[PDB]
């Protein structure tokens, strides 16, 4: 860091292309980090969701659901059952008679 | 089932099949017109053609 004596320089933070480069770099870095990771394509299935049986305060009513969904397994000829606790924001109602929600 | 001329007999086929959906365990019957050049005969109990 070298101080410049007797130098006046006109700045404009809204014309600074360093922000555009930082934005593009963070998008590219995020996408490159996320790409070589586990895809959840097999988990886009219908879920049977019910209410959480623990002690729920007045503000948390309807925020969590205890959902069950059959899933896949290391082998391709078998399946499994996976109970899990989801936030209401992460699931959406679907139109069915057997399952209640889908992952958003 | 539309009106065609003699030169186009057999050129276009109405083909039905079971396609997947966004959900992994929910299929969907579909029906689509294909050109004959885009399909190949394949004999089965319930099917006649497959994509070339």
């Amino acid at each position: 860091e070298i101080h410049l004596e007797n130098v006046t320089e006109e700045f404009n933070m809204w014309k600074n292309n360093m922000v555009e480069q930082m934005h593009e770099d963070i998008i590219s870095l995020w996408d490159q980090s996320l790409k070589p990771c586990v895809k959840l394509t097999p988990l886009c299935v219908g879920l049977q969701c019910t209410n959480v049986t623990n002690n729920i305060t007045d503000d948390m009513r309807g925020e969590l659901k205890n959902c069950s969904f059959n899933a896949t397994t290391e082998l391709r000829n078998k399946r499994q059952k996976v109970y899990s606790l989801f936030y209401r924001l992460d699931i959406v109602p679907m139109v069915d008679l057997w399952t209640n929600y889908r992952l958003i | 089932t539309n009106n065609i001329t003699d030169d186009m007999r057999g050129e276009l086929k109405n083909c039905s099949f079971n396609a997947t959906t966004e959900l992994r365990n929910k299929r969907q019957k579909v029906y689509s017109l294909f050109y004959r050049l885009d399909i190949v005969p394949m004999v089965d109990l319930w099917t006649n053609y497959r994509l070339i």
Epitope: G46, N70, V95, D96, L97, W98, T99 | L23, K26
Partner: antibody, heavy 129, light 106 residues
């Protein structure tokens, strides 16, 4: 398309029952079986249903703790267990079949649902309980 | 889901009747079923979803739907139609509902 009911006993307060619906004439494992309550001279009320192979239920909001529908694919028989009936809602209980397959196994047990919401066809006879 | 309790008309006169509800029962989804229950016997499926028919049904019993109200017309009404006509539909929270039953006296 043959649905043969079993169990037609009216019981005293405190009782619980298990009714059965034997099925034949169609591929048992791929069609839904549902239960409908006549109510004592009132309109119909939906109780629930099951897909035998998978074994998945959707009990209604009023029966979500009482009714227990099950199915046996080896004997091709559907069962419904009704706890804590007491003497209320004495009714004729009916067993119904789906219009078409709900799941559809090509081969093996890759079920694949078919979005059929007409699960009330071949409406079998009922039993008064 | 509700419906009129009874309708009469007369033998030979085509009779129409309907069931009503909200958008979550009849308006959307397009899955409205009707059943004809004769006394001391199981209800018979008649209309499937809007305007269809399980084979074996004379003169189709074709229906219609508009807004949140679904209806059916029985053309060529006979004495054999003295039955309780029920309306049912898919309702939200992934359930089925039924109406109270319409008694057709012919």
């Amino acid at each position: 398309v043959q649905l043969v009911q079993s169990g037609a006993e009216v019981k005293k307060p405190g009782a619980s029952v298990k009714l059965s619906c034997k099925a034949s004439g169609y591929t048992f494992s791929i069609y839904a079986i549902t239960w409908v309550r006549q109510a004592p001279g009132q309109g119909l009320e939906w109780m629930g249903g099951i897909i035998p192979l998978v074994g998945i239920t959707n009990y209604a909001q009023k029966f979500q703790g009482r009714v227990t529908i099950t199915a046996d694919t080896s004997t091709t028989t559907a069962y419904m267990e009704l706890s804590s009936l007491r003497s209320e809602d004495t009714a004729v209980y009916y067993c119904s079949r789906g219009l078409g397959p709900s799941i559809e196994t090509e081969d093996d047990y890759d079920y694949s649902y078919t979005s059929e919401y007409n699960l009330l066809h071949v409406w079998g006879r009922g039993v008064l309980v | 889901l509700t419906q009129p309790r009874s309708v009469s008309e007369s033998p030979g006169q085509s009779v129409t009747f309907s069931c009503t509800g909200t958008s979550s029962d009849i308006g959307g989804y397009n899955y409205v079923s009707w059943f004809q229950q004769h006394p001391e016997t199981a209800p018979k499926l008649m209309i499937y979803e809007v305007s269809k028919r399980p084979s074996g049904v004379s003169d189709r019993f074709s229906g219609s739907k508009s807004g949140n109200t679904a209806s059916l017309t029985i053309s060529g009404l006979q004495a054999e139609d003295e039955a309780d006509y029920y309306c049912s539909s898919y309702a939200d929270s992934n359930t089925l509902v039924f109406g109270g039953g319409t008694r057709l006296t012919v």
